[PDB]
Structure formats: structure tokens, C-alpha cells
Amino acid sequence: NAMKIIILGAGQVGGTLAENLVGENNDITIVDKDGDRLRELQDKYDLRVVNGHASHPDVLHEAGAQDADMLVAVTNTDETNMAACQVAFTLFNTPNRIARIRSPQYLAQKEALFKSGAIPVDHLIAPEELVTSYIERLIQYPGALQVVSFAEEKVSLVAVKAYYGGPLVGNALSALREHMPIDTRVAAIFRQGRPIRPQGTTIIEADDEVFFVAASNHIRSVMSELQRLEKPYRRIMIVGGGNIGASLAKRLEQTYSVKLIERNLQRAEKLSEELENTIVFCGDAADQELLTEENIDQVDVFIALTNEDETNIMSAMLAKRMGAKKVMVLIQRGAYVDLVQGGVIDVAISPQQATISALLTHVRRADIVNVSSLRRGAAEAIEAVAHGDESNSKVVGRAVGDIKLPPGTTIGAIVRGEEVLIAHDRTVIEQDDHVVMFLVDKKYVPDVEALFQPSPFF
């Protein structure tokens, strides 16, 4: 009865996916040619390993493709991913084939190649598109440091950083709720590298990252009633004319004043040609003389998107020191995203982290829980679906205030069809509600699953 998932590729994405999925209700097999890496994973987690080339029939067979419920293709190459989905489909009829695709040349023919059945991938996960769209999303919500997405698209969290003199600091959460009885509440707080469970007694301090629940169509409204929506950004500076930076420039250049700095001379000329309303410089990312010549002191958002984490961090730190109001950096790993952001560096984004979020939108734990895009050390936000009527459930027909939750766990909101309800103690759960929670420690996710399990499961 546990769902069977095969993950092809033991890289950072494949391994982190396995970490978030393994449990009594999801059985994991991971495939790679690096035996040292497989051994490490099998020590950490309860899963099966197969050493071999991910798209070979014998390797897929040994990994259990004939009986698997999902295949996740996150190997080194787009072509091995596509081959593996094809071979698995043809020889084993494996359902739910999902692939990471990095090459924009394939993504330009999405419909013709991947929706027609020519290459039989059910879902494509395109890291560079996800990162570009995510940065654009932050830019449209001036003042926001993070927007949290769920499988259930209609609800979001938005985070703002509390500051000396700001409208949030020094207030208890219970008092917050009485000053403004807004369609929001605090879903989570992070303070000095630690998650903080929101309580009535919780007092917001300077430098807290405070996450607010909001319907996805209501983000501006909430930020505005919180007094935390800023005026639109105007001057954007991008460092790195690679795929992400060039695509971002194109999308921003008509409404913002964009400047872009590319280190490679040949690339810089091509982009100068191609980006008609962006001013392109050939120069180094962390050149003081250039940044002052280009009025870095007036930049609203400095966005460092090179291939090198170090260059991005150092150029953003410099940009911040020189008076850019906000800085954002591309970093490879999500473990590092926790470490880098929240101080001098306003926003850190990982293509790997974005890929994992998208993958988690397509796979549920126990058919109940989707893990959201907020995952920081042990803490994360999730949503859970409440299946069954009151006689087939432990939570349907109960009030939020009577539900006994695991430690460090809070319910922030409920999605009921189309409606987003902010949770209160008297809120009664209804059949097929999606319940949004924050957990300080994800080891209690299995306890959420068990709680929401309907009778027919037993």
C-alpha cells in the first residue's frame, strides 16, 4: 500500500527529494552510478539503492519500474532524463513520469515535444524558468522577501523583515490581531537562524522574518493593511548575462530602468544588441568604480545571477554596503539559501531549491500532505487534505481549537474549494479542505499524515 517512487539521480535534488519523501507511506528507490553517494544516502535514510545508468532497461527493472507509482528523472543530463521516461513508459508502463529539463532549446518546443506524446514526460521541471519567474514575482510585491507557494495555488505566505521604527516591531501577536480585525495572521517567524512557533505571547523584534498567510489574490492588500507594501521599484541592476539574467532583463526592461553587467565581452555585445531597452555593460560584478559611475547608491534591487556563488555573494554584499536598497543572489544549494539570506543579503534563491519545490507539488506524502516552498533546516510549511466525511475522519467536522496537533505545529489557514479562510479556534474543518500548517520540526509530518488519514485507509 505505500506509494513507490523511483528517483533517478543521487545529486543534491534527488537526495533532498528522498529526504522529504521517505516514511511509512512512501517507499523510495534511488538510482545513480556513484556508489559512494548511494551508500551515504542509504545510511541516512530508509531507502533502496540501485547502482547503474538510469535509462537502461535492466537498471529500471531492478529499481522496480514495473510496479512503481512515480518516476522522477533528475540525472546529469536532459537526454538521460528523457530516455529514462521513454524506456520506463515503453517497457514498464510506469505512471507519473517527471523530468528536470535545463536546456531552453527543448523548452521552446514544450507543446510539440512533451505534450503531444512524442517524448512521454508528464511534467517538466525547468529550474531556470522557475527562478526567473520567482524573482519577477518578488519584484511585483515591493517589500516582500519571500513568497511561499503550495500545491494548492490559491494560498500563499508572504514574508517581511521587521525593523526598528516599523509598524510590526514590539507588538505581541495577540495584540496584532486586535489592532487590525485583515484577512491574515502570522504563520511563522524566523529569528537569529531559528524558527519560532507563532503564539499570542510572541513579540515581534527587529530583524525577525515574519511570514503572513494570505490568499494569493490578496497579497498586496494584506501587505498594504500591514503598512508593509512599498512603492514600486524603479532602478534594477543585474549582474550576470546568462540564461536567467538575460531572460529577467527582457521581462523587466519595459517597466523598470534595467542595467546589466556581463563579464564576457562577446556575450555583452550580443545582449546589448538583443536587449533594446536595457543598458548593458561589459565589466566585473564587484568593481567599485563601475558601481559608483552607475549610481549604485540609487539602485532599488541589485540582482547577482552569475554561475559562481562566491561572485554573487561578494558583489551583493558590496552593492548593499554602497547603498543599493535591496540585493538578491543566486546560490546553487538550498542549505546555503538559509545561511546567506536574512541580513545584508535580502533574498537568496537556489535553482535546486526551486526544482525540489516544483517536484513536491506533484507528489503527496500518504496522498495527504504537500510540502510547500518554505523549507528551512528542520522547519517547513505544508498543506494537508482532509479526506472523508466526519464519520470517516478524525478532523472533518472538528473545530481547529479542539484538534490536537503535534508539537511545534500550527494551523494558519484553510482552502475550501475557492475560498481562503484564515484559521481561528472556532473554524470547523470540512470534507476536502486543504489545511495549511507550519511545523518547527518536520519530523512531526508523519504525525500530521496519521491525524488526517481517513477511515477507508485503515
Cβ closer to a second copy: 6 or 385?
6
Of the ranges 77-85, 327-335, 397-405, 409-417, which one interacts with Cl ion (CB under 5 A)?
A: 327-335
CB 219 within 8 A of CB 175: no
Show contacts of 260-266: CB within 8 Å, 24+ apart.
261/237, 261/285, 261/290, 263/306
Binders in 31-70 for a second copy, by CB under 8 A: 53, 55-59
Is residue 385 a contact point for Cl ion (CB under 5 A)?
Answer: yes
CA distance 441 to 101: 32
Max distance between CA atoms of the chain, in angstroms, equals: 70
Residue 230 CB coordination number (10 Å): 14
Give the one entry of a second copy, Cl ion, none that residue 80 binds, where binding means its C-beta sits below a cut-off of 5 to 8 angstroms depending on kind. Answer: a second copy
CA distance 87 to 79: 12
Question: Cell for 279?
Answer: 543598458
Radius of gyration of the chain (CA): 23
Give the one entry of a second copy, Cl ion, none that residue 186 binds, where binding means its C-beta sits below a cut-off of 5 to 8 angstroms depending on kind. Answer: Cl ion
Give the one entry of a second copy, Cl ion, none that residue 353 binds, where binding means its C-beta sits below a cut-off of 5 to 8 angstroms depending on kind. Answer: Cl ion
Give the one entry of a second copy, Cl ion, none that residue 356 binds, where binding means its C-beta sits below a cut-off of 5 to 8 angstroms depending on kind. Answer: Cl ion
CA distance 30 to 12: 12
Here's the x/- map for a second copy, 70-109, by CB under 8 A: it reads as -------xxxx-xx--xx-xxx-----------x-xx-xx
CB 119 within 8 A of CB 129: no
Residues 6+ apart with CB under 8 A from 425: 399, 400, 401
Here's the x/- map for a second copy, 235-264, by CB under 8 A: it reads as ------------------------------
Here's the x/- map for Cl ion, 188-207, by CB under 5 A: it reads as --------------xx----
Query: Which of 52, 166, 242, 377 touches Cl ion (CB under 5 A)?
Result: 166
Give the one entry of a second copy, Cl ion, none that residue 105 binds, where binding means its C-beta sits below a cut-off of 5 to 8 angstroms depending on kind. Answer: a second copy
Q: What sections of 67-183 are H helices per DSSP? A: 78-92, 104-107, 110, 127-140, 173-179
Residue numbers preceding breaks in the chain (C to N > 2.5 A): 181
Binders in 388-417 for Cl ion, by CB under 5 A: 388-389, 392
Of the ranges 113-121, 270-278, 329-337, 431-439, which one interacts with a second copy (CB under 8 A)?
A: 113-121
Q: Give the interface with a second copy as residue ranges (CB under 8 A).
A: 53, 55-59, 77-80, 82-83, 86-87, 89-91, 103, 105-106, 108-109, 112-113, 116, 118-119
Residues forming contacts to Cl ion in the complex (CB under 5 A) are: 48-49, 118, 120, 127, 162-163, 166, 168-169, 173, 185-186, 202-203, 219-220, 232, 334, 343-344, 351, 353, 356, 375, 385, 388-389, 392
